[PDB]
């Protein structure tokens, strides 16, 4: 039901963030891509 | 995606080129058949034994 | 007296930060763990 990111050799699920991910191109370019929230720790830290 | 990452070429270099990579691979496997169809001289390593 | 972090193969110490470290779990689990203040390079940049 919920998406995560994890180290391939041992299941330890992590929150999908811009610390755990990087970007290239756009959503039209990649085969098999899906829709999901990418969180960012800087957001509550600015807002609070 | 991992394979390419294992040679320091980041995962997205596969995904931004995936059908091109599969065409290069399909072309290369095709050339193996034509090479092995043409001649026995490649298998000298076995026909010598 | 002070806690630093360094690469394994040549002593080149640094102040411990959330850029130098990653988090998992809590202080119960890790045999032989210690305490120190982790610096957060975002806080002076939010506050100033
Ligand atoms: C997928 O992971 C999420 C997050 O851990 C699970 O959702 C949580 O479920 C527990 C009960 O098991 C609740 O206490 C949490 O409040 C839920 N959190 C959220 C963000 O929804 C979810 O149960 C897992 N999905 C499946 C099918 O197991
Ligand atoms: C790290 O610091 C914590 C406090 O943040 C220490 O926790 C105390 O531990 C003793 C022994 O179990 C307890 O008597 C106290 O009640 C604890 N205090 C709190 C606030 O939890 C901890 O011992 C320190 N650990 C090390 C290895 O330095
Ligand atoms: C990401 C991907 O390849 N998805 C395909 C899907 O589009 C196709 O309809 C299905 C056929 O069973 O196989 C899978
Ligand atoms: C985490 C760990 O190994 N701690 C041990 C401690 O229990 C022991 O008393 C001390 C002296 O032998 O050496 C260290």
């Amino acid at each position: 039901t919920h998406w995560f990111v994890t180290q391939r050799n041992f299941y330890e699920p992590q929150i999908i963030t811009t610390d755990n991910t990087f970007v290239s191109g756009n959503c039209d370019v990649v085969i098999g891509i899906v829709n999901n929230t990418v969180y960012d720790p800087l957001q509550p830290e600015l807002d609070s | 995606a991992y394979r390419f990452n294992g040679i320091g070429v980041t995962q997205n270099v596969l995904y931004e080129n995936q059908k091109l990579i599969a065409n290069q691979f399909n072309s290369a496997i095709g050339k193996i058949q034509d090479s092995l169809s043409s001649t026995a001289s490649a298998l000298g390593k076995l026909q010598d034994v």
Side-chain angles (χ1 to χ4, degrees), chain A, chain B:
Chain A
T1 52
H2 301 63
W3 287 86
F4 298 96
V5 69
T6 196
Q7 69 194 339
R8 45 190 65 138
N9 296 338
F10 186 77
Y11 185 76
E12 175 194 303
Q14 298 296 352
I15 305 308
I16 291 172
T17 73
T18 63
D19 291 348
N20 301 337
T21 63
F22 81 90
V23 165
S24 184
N26 70 65
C27 282
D28 308 338
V29 187
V30 177
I31 296 175
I33 188 159
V34 301
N35 305 14
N36 211 73
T37 293
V38 178
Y39 172 58
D40 173 8
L42 183 56
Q43 290 171 322
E45 286 294 316
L46 288 162
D47 298 352
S48 181
Chain B
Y2 296 138
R3 296 277 163 168
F4 273 66
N5 185 91
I7 66 165
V9 174
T10 310
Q11 293 175 315
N12 63 285
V13 180
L14 173 65
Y15 298 125
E16 296 181 48
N17 302 278
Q18 179 180 332
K19 287 187 173 184
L20 165 63
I21 280 161
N23 291 342
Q24 286 183 345
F25 174 75
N26 293 345
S27 174
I29 295 290
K31 291 179 183 181
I32 301 316
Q33 300 202 342
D34 293 359
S35 186
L36 294 179
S37 180
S38 174
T39 182
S41 60
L43 282 78
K45 294 186 177 183
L46 305 178
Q47 181 60 95
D48 177 39
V49 170

